[PDB]
Design a protein around this nucleic acid. Structure first.
Ligand SMILES: [Zn+2]
Ligand SMILES: [Zn+2]
Lengths: 115, 115
DNA sequence: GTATGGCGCCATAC
DNA sequence: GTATGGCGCCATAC
């Protein structure tokens, strides 16, 4: 209940972290990994995963988009448009490209590239 | 293209009339019936129908709600909450209650009842 | 029971 | 081809 506020158009992201924290409060020690990672981009951070839809897309308060794009745009670049502006760092084990069963929504595992 | 502007949070209704006009430009003389009806509540008005979903609900720019509630709230009471505040007039042949195959979204075929 | 909202699937706009 | 968005179906909150 207060985890959402601490992790935090504003009312749409609020609905998005909400969608997220519900998935993370269920995973083991998962909320903890994320709270630390919002603090330091340079400090090492563990992967925080959510399940992957067949589509790839995640729908949040009736808007539908890719998960790492969503949570980056909540926590880093609010002007972020599409996944092309994103690229995964070398740190991350479950990037969106990976097509693996889970997908990392830790916002600092990706850098923004304006092509 | 200009029909939408003439029939006309504002940018969500704009997306809704858009969803609508596309269905009406396909029906025969249907756009015409609606243009007249936005003018006069007291003047007699023909039914303007759209298809009915099994659910009943209509999704518009990612929000989902009942059709007569949507188009009433666009064109009459913007503070309208649920379908309980609505009741169909005696004029209408395809009210939402009717569960018929089409459904009348002419905003003036319904009156608002605060219970 | 009713209300509400996401996902897989599909249809349509570039 | 990629992007985008609605509907039927289902799962969950009252
Ligand atoms: Zn990662
Ligand atoms: Zn009618």
């Amino acid at each position: 209940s207060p985890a959402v506020k601490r992790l935090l158009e504003e009312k749409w992201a609020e609905k998005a972290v909400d969608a997220l924290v519900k998935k993370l409060k269920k995973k083991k020690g998962a909320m903890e990994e994320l709270e630390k990672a919002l603090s330091s981009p340079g400090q090492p951070s563990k992967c925080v995963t959510i399940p992957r839809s067949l589509d790839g897309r995640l729908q949040v308060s009736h808007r539908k988009g890719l998960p790492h794009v969503i949570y980056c745009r909540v926590w880093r670049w609010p002007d972020l448009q599409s996944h092309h502006e994103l690229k995964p760092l070398d740190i991350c084990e479950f990037p969106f490209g990976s097509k693996q069963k889970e997908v990392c929504i830790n916002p600092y595992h990706y850098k923004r590239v304006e092509s």
